[model samples]
Target: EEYKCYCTDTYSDCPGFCKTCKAEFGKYICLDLISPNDCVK
Candidate 1:
């Protein structure tokens, strides 16, 4: 298990010049597991 960078989950709401994972919410506080948006298990 290696290469575990964080942040950037399945969020929503992109207003005022934005469209990249937006940043409204989605299981974002993961100093943890269950890989997605980036992976290496």
Candidate 2:
């Protein structure tokens, strides 16, 4: 499955959420959004 990274703020954010997903689930991908897309992970 594919994953996206949506953060509330540009700074003080956690990449681990997506990184972990990538680490745990192979082929997982993440992207950043300008604003909250209601997709936390």
Residue-level lDDT tens digits of model 1 in 1-41: 24545433442443222233333344222223333446542
- lDDT of each candidate versus the true structure: 0.37, 0.38
Error of 2 at 31 (Å): 3.2
Cα lDDT tens digits, model 2, 1-41, are: 13433532322333664332332233344444433444444
**What clash pairs does model 2 have?**
none
What is the TM-score (0 to 1) of candidate 1? 0.17
Clashing pairs in 1: none
Q: What overall lDDT, based on C-alpha atoms, would model 1 receive against the true structure?
A: 0.37
Q: lDDT score of model 2?
A: 0.38
